[PDB]
Amino acid sequence: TKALVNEARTECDRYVRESPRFYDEGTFSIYQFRQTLQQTSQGYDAQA
Amino acid sequence: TKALVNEARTECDRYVRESPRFYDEGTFSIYQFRQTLQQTSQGYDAQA
Amino acid sequence: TKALVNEARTECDRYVRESPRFYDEGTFSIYQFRQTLQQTSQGYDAQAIVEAEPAIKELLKLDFEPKVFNTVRKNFRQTVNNTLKTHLLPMAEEQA
Amino acid sequence: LTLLNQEMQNLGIEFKKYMSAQINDVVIGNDREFDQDFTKLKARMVAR
Amino acid sequence: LDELLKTFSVMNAYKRATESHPRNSTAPFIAVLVEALYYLANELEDAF
Amino acid sequence: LDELLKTFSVMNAYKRATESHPRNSTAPFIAVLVEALYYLANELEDAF
């Protein structure tokens, strides 16, 4: 049980790192937040 | 002393939020990491 | 020590399986033995096959060189770092 | 007696701090001693 | 995985961002993604 | 501020990223920026 648990956790630690597929211009743009920051999100909240 | 400390900390909490100036295509691009990820950073390290 | 030994052995069990690179017509042909069997190897021995030793050595290099380099360079480093932290910290917290 | 245990509690909190600092240095390579041994391990296998 | 990511909401990852930092009370917009990886990874790890 | 940001190094913010997350031992490339804000802000706050 100990051996498998350690091995399983080790693999589970590799998903966190972002692969090249994680970023895609068409699928999603990180810069659309500017549209929510350019006089759009008035208060210091996370609702918009 | 207590009043000023609380007031000073409150202002210090506003710097963390990123302003529009924080992002600038010419000054720096977030996508240059791909150049370090596209078969450049071989190991799971942070040296390159 | 037990955790790393088990993890290391598990990876070592994957090299045995042949990858597509293991076979290559130009690098080496499995059918050249016929040349040593078509009235060439008279006795039931394995002496004439020694002539093919230089060729097989290159073939094994091609198959294993990418796999071994892939593991030690990329995979091995991550396992050691995570394994040490995932076990040491909970022990330390229990010490408190 | 009302102060003896306060030192004990800080000892537990402080103990985790040192352990967390030492382990963190290994994950990134700050501990120069660990790196020297690690590179020795890689060289032997490749040479082997 | 299908059920976990289907129910994923921006009002669940941003909940953890404040918790992770006891002092700061204002997380950047970019912090949403980072917490998503760990929330979507650590939860997945427990399943195994 | 001038002295603080001048001495800023990638080998100081990435140090804190591992500490912030006791379980995960691999931070994404994007996490460098997030830790920079808090490291460059919390340190500045103590000055006041």
Q: What is the 3-state secondary structure (H, E, C) of C7-72?
A: HHHHHHCCCCCCCHHHCECCCECHHHHHHHHCCCCCCCCCCHHHHHHHHHHHHHHHHHHHHHHHHH
Provide the token pair at C88: 């040491």
Neighboring chain C residues of D45 at a CB cutoff of 8 Å: 68, 72
No. of helices (H) and no. of strands (E), chain B = 2, 0
Size of interface C-F (CB pairs under 8 A): 10
Cβ F18–D28 below 8 Å, yes or no? yes
Q: How was this structure determined?
A: cryo-EM
Helix (H, G, I), strand (E, B) or coil at C76: helix
Enter the DSSP assignment of B4. H
**CB atoms near residue C17 (< 10 Å):** 8
Q: What is the resolution of this structure in A?
A: 4.1
Tokens of D13: 């909190």
- Tell me the C-alpha distance between C73 and A33, whole Å: 38
**String of DSSP letters for E1-48:** -HHHHHT--HHHHHHHHHHH-SS-----TTHHHHHHHHHHHHHHHHH-
DSSP code, position B1 = -
- F17 CB neighbour count, 10 Å cutoff: 22
> Is B38 close to A31, i.e. CB distance below 8 A?
no
Give the residue among B26, B29, C77, F29 at the shortest CA–CA distance from A22: F29
How crowded is residue B46: how many other Cβ atoms within 10 Å of its Cβ? 20
Q: Do chains D and E touch (3 or more CB pairs under 8 A)?
A: no
Cβ contacts of C83 on chain B, cutoff 8 Å: none
Neighbours of F21 (CB within 10 A): 16
Q: Supply the Cα-derived Rg of chain F in whole angstroms.
A: 11
**Cβ–Cβ < 8 Å for F17, F35:** yes
Q: Which of C88, C93, C95 sits opposite D23 (nearest CB)?
A: C88
F22 close to E (CB below 8 A): no
Neighbours of C93 (CB within 10 A): 13
F26: left (phi over 0), alpha (psi -120 to 50) or beta: beta
Chains B and C touch (3+ CB pairs under 8 A): yes
Residues of C in contact with D46 (CB under 8 A): 68-69, 72
Å from D1 to nearest chain F CA? 34
Q: Helix D32-47 to helix C53-70 angle, to the nearest 10 degrees?
A: 160
Tally of CB atoms within 10 A around F34: 25
* b/e map E19-46, b = 16+ CB within 10 Å: eebeebebbbbbbebbbbbbbbbbeebe
Whole-angstrom distance, CA of residue A10 vs CA of residue C90: 16
Amino acid at D3: L
Other CB atoms within 10 Å distance of the CB of residue B40: 10
Collect all residues of chain A within an 8 Å Cβ-Cβ radius of residue C3. Answer: 2-3, 6
CA C62, CA C64: separation in Å to the nearest integer?
A: 6
